[PDB]
């Protein structure tokens, strides 16, 4: 009994061919009823998991086309927008990976807004240690600066600038058409060095009071409603820029463009059957902050500012992977694609052997191995050992969990011989006789064995073999032990 099955038969029990001898106790958490949870090519749903919570989200039908790139296609989600499926199998995804990003085509902040420390409101959060910047639930109001001023050090030695007042397009952007109608920058310089050069087209606003106007009090204090003077043009906005740069008090009237934000977007339904051991594998609704100074590219090129990322801390101590399963998503009855996020629950099973001279036959037990719902103990044990002959069971020991072998005494293990009557008092049951010896006045003993049943005409013996052990030898066996052929 190498695997370790506990015996089911005891000493002095008659057994026939096919009778079991021992069974295992292979159990795991959440055992119970199968409820269509068969494995190993038995039911349609081959992949078997915890099958206790079954975290599933629907309405995630996707295609598998090879056009417009290699895996790019339109996804008709709840918002009707192309969701970037950056968490694909085989890509070595991580917990809190950057997959929650959407497509930013026309609502991307071109100039964007830098991070300040003036009017940030906090209640319990901050930037202590690694907090991934300032995360705010209310949403801080940061001033939008449309400054297209970059350190484009033009070579004034070759393309000298005479006046450069008409700064509309650029100096040497590509060949001729820089940004708009031909306009040469003034390449603003400093005392033997260079400085910030304004590339934005701007506007001539040298009229009066750039920073000390009626509306410009206590810093900027730009008001969308009220203008710099009652009666000014308020067709779109009146927002202005305080920074002038060079060339006198140039006000640089700059309207501020912000996101539409019509209302709250439809929140995805992210509440599945999270009743089994508080197993919640869902996405949050946070955006954090990932571009302070260096992560944001300080250049003309613009990227998706305020990257969309949700931090997941569900099931602490087991969220290290958080990849769940990314297998081909299909519904139960139909084949509608979804996004399943169930945790893997592998099952370990073995095979069976036919028979052998050492160990007995192994057959798949008709147990409740197919069942795992709620309670601890899944009894998936499927190991059985059956006899091949008929006899009595021996070898059971009182030792604690130290049973590795069994003995079956068959009928061929006994010998009945009709020699003569013993007529002696030295032949009690259990006596040992060694080959040819003088038992009675006549008839020597032909064989050696253990006396079992004496008769006036017959004699019963158990086949036995003695070995001589000299003094000082090393013993490899115990007293009431069991050995196989060829053992030392």
């Amino acid at each position: 009994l190498l695997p370790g099955a506990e015996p089911t038969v005891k000493n002095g029990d008659r057994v026939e061919v096919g009778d079991v001898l021992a069974e295992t106790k292979l159990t795991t958490e959440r055992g119970g009823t199968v409820r269509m949870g068969e494995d190993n090519g038995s039911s349609t749903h081959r992949e078997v998991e915890i099958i206790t919570a079954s975290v599933v989200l629907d309405t995630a039908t996707v295609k598998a086309e090879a056009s417009q790139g290699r895996e790019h296609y339109v996804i008709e989600t709840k918002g009707g927008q192309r969701f970037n499926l950056l968490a694909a199998p085989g890509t070595k995804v991580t917990t809190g990976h950057v997959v929650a990003e959407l497509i930013d085509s026309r609502y991307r902040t071109q100039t964007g807004g830098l991070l300040k420390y003036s009017g940030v409101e906090i209640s319990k959060k901050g930037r202590a240690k690694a907090k991934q910047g300032y995360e705010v639930t209310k949403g801080g109001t940061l001033l939008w600066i449309p400054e297209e001023t970059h350190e484009v050090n033009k070579d004034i030695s070759l393309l000298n600038v005479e006046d450069g007042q008409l700064v509309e397009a650029g100096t040497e952007v590509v060949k001729d058409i820089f940004c708009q109608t031909t306009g040469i920058v003034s390449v603003t310089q400093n005392n033997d060095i260079l400085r910030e050069i304004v590339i934005k087209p701007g506007d001539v606003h040298v009229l009066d009071d750039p920073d000390t106007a009626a509306k410009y009090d206590e810093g900027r204090l730009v008001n969308a409603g009220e203008e710099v003077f009652p009666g000014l043009t308020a067709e779109q906005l009146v927002w202005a820029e305080a920074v002038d740069g060079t060339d006198g008090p140039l006000l640089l009237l700059r309207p501020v463009q912000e996101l539409v934000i019509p209302d709250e977007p439809p929140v995805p339904s992210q509440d599945s059957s999270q009743e089994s051991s508080s197993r919640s594998i869902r996405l949050r609704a946070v955006q954090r902050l990932q571009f302070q100074d260096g992560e944001r590219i300080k250049s003309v090129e613009g990227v998706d500012l305020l990257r969309t990322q949700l931090v997941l801390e569900s099931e602490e101590g087991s969220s290290q992977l958080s990849a769940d399963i990314e297998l081909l998503p299909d519904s139960k009855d139909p084949e509608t694609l979804r996004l399943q996020l169930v945790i893997i629950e592998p099952v370990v099973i073995r095979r069976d052997v036919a028979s052998d001279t050492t160990h007995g036959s192994t057959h798949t037990e008709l147990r409740v191995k197919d069942g795992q719902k709620v309670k601890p103990g899944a009894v998936i044990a499927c190991t059985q050992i059956q006899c091949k002959e008929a006899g009595v069971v021996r070898g059971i020991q009182e030792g604690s969990e130290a049973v590795r072998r069994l003995l079956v005494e068959r009928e061929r293990d006994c010998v009945t011989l009709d020699l003569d009557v013993t007529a002696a008092t030295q032949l009690q049951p259990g006596s040992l006789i060694v080959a040819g010896t003088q038992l009675v006045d006549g008839i020597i003993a032909p064989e050696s064995g253990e006396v079992r049943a004496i008769a006036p005409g017959q004699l019963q013996l158990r086949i036995a073999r003695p070995y001589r052990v000299s003094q000082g030898a090393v013993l490899h066996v115990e007293d009431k032990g069991l050995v196989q052929r060829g053992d030392n």
Partner: protein, 50 residues
Amino acid sequence: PKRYDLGRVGRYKLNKKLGLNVADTVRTLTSEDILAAIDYLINLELDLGG
């Protein structure tokens, strides 16, 4: 196959001893050979008798 060679005799003896059925044109070590060698060592330790 420039610094290691088994030979026909070596492959034949390995197949005979460990009871494998690898093709006769393979003259480099494989993973099955190592696994079978470790299995034979373990079985010999535990006194199989064969």
